[PDB]
Amino acid sequence: RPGEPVVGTGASLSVELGPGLLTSIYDGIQRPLEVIREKTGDFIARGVTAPALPRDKKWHFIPKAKVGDKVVGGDIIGEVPETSIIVHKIMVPPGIEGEIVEIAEEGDYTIEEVIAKVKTPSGEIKELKMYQRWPVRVKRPYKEKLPPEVPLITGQRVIDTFFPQAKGGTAAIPGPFGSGKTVTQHQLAKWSDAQVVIYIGCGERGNEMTDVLEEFPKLKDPKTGKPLMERTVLIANTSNMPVAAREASIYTGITIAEYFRDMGYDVALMADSTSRWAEALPAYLASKLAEFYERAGRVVTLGSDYRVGSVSVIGAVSPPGGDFSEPVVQNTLRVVKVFWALDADLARRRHFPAINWLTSYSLYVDAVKDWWHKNIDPEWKAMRDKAMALLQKESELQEIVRIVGPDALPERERAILLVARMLREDYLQQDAFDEVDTYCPPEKQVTMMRVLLNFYDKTMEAINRGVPLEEIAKLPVREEIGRMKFERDVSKIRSLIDKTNEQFEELFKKYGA
């Protein structure tokens, strides 16, 4: 039911975009959860019954345009406080321009009501509401797609520092989001500097549906202290749902995602995944998947004002079982510019986040280095390169030690392992359960890095002067450097640099052991 008919390839799988999207839980083709099912095919499709946006709910509409104003698609004509977190921006649908000949006054109205009328150049009068419809299969229009430039600040050291995600970029991460082996997936949803989150919690099973049904509605927004759902849109993909819906779920979400970026918001699209993502709609499948990821990006939105928004995509990769080949992983890792490899062995060893700093990668490092250099620290890129070289050296050294033992190791090599270990423990590792280290501000990330890299220089300098490594290993400032991640006052952390220098001096005084 619902209503719809047409020829060509594709009936017209659309989506409603307007107030009532937040806190909402839909499915592959947008409709309140636990509803009837669709039907697909490499041709068209069908449905059944259930709305999308509440027809009864009343929204406070605030006029942001006067009669006589000229407008274009994307222009913002009003504002609606949808939740205590997000202000919904009402825009002229794409492909509509002309003069505003009629506009509602600040009041309360339901979605179907008409809040404005635009007289097109042709003279035709178009009626505008607070919502609009769009074909999930057609990428929403924008003026220009900007090159990766701004990082998506995650707050997680390993990611922000070594494997950056650009706002509007594409990232892949292993296993199901529901997996309890790590909590990085959840840290990403609530700390990334995106105003809105579009969660396609697919690959659900056994109870991962009810595990999110009455749970998330209680998860909080660390930034405001209100429910995270108040700035989220859930898109479930259970096993009793047709392959068709799940297949359309990423398109319904990416479209809703594009819609919010059109307002000037940065939004994060997180797509969960399990075994055999779909079977609706290797060869052609590759083109499709790529097409999806291509709709990611930071753009200059439609509109008269000059506005930027973006959709960053984080997709879960779940191969049939370790094989890490087809479908998921293979095709995906070829598209995405970022890959954070949760490693079960890092996890068993209790190293968190369990991200393998040797097999992860970000093709956005150079793309975001200038933002860091201009706004946070002139030495960002040099510092991370240096820390990575350290970790790279440690890796090679540990391989060799695995063979000939560690007894023949020179002081110089022991020092490298000493500092490399401090990097792993004092920087890479982050406590998602600590009230302070759960989020690490850009400013704090670099200061901690400088404290570590300065300890390194000083360590290699002391060794070159005959200082016993054993003497440096028990240096008092080391224990402070290891609790650094727990200090919320960046200036106290920053002072460890001076505290390090003097201490080495007292080691340059005693001259040795």
From Swiss-Prot:
Species in which this protein is naturally found: Pyrococcus horikoshii (strain ATCC 700860 / DSM 12428 / JCM 9974 / NBRC 100139 / OT-3)
Classification via SUPFAM superfamilies: C-terminal domain of alpha and beta subunits of F1 ATP synthase, Hedgehog/intein (Hint) domain, Homing endonucleases, N-terminal domain of alpha and beta subunits of F1 ATP synthase, P-loop containing nucleoside triphosphate hydrolases
Protein name: A-type ATP synthase subunit A
Classification via NCBIfam families: intein_Cterm, intein_Nterm, PRK04192.1
Post-translational modification comment from the UniProt entry: This protein undergoes a protein self splicing that involves a post-translational excision of the VDE intervening region (intein) followed by peptide ligation.
UniProtKB keywords: ATP synthesis, ATP-binding, Autocatalytic cleavage, Cell membrane, Endonuclease, Hydrogen ion transport, Hydrolase, Intron homing, Ion transport, Membrane, Nuclease, Nucleotide-binding, Protein splicing, Translocase, Transport
Reactions catalysed: ATP + H2O + 4 H(+)(in) = ADP + phosphate + 5 H(+)(out)
Its biological purpose: Component of the A-type ATP synthase that produces ATP from ADP in the presence of a proton gradient across the membrane. The A chain is the catalytic subunit.
Pfam families, alphabetized: ATP-synt_ab, ATP-synt_ab_N, ATP-synt_ab_Xtn, ATP-synt_VA_C, Intein_splicing
Location(s), subcellular: Cell membrane
Membrane topology annotation: Peripheral membrane protein
GO biological process: intein-mediated protein splicing; intron homing; proton motive force-driven plasma membrane ATP synthesis
Chief subcellular location: membrane
Extent of the signal sequence: none
Anything else known: The intein interrupts the ATP-binding site.
Entry's family note: Belongs to the ATPase alpha/beta chains family.
E.C. code: 7.1.2.2, 3.1.-.-
Complexes and interactors: Has multiple subunits with at least A(3), B(3), C, D, E, F, H, I and proteolipid K(x).
Gene: atpA
Gene3D superfamilies: 2.40.30.20, 2.40.50.100, Bovine Mitochondrial F1-atpase, Atp Synthase Beta Chain, Chain D, domain 3, Hedgehog/Intein (Hint) domain, Homing endonucleases, P-loop containing nucleotide triphosphate hydrolases
MF terms (GO), sorted A to Z: ATP binding; endonuclease activity; proton-transporting ATP synthase activity, rotational mechanism; proton-transporting ATPase activity, rotational mechanism
GO cellular component: plasma membrane
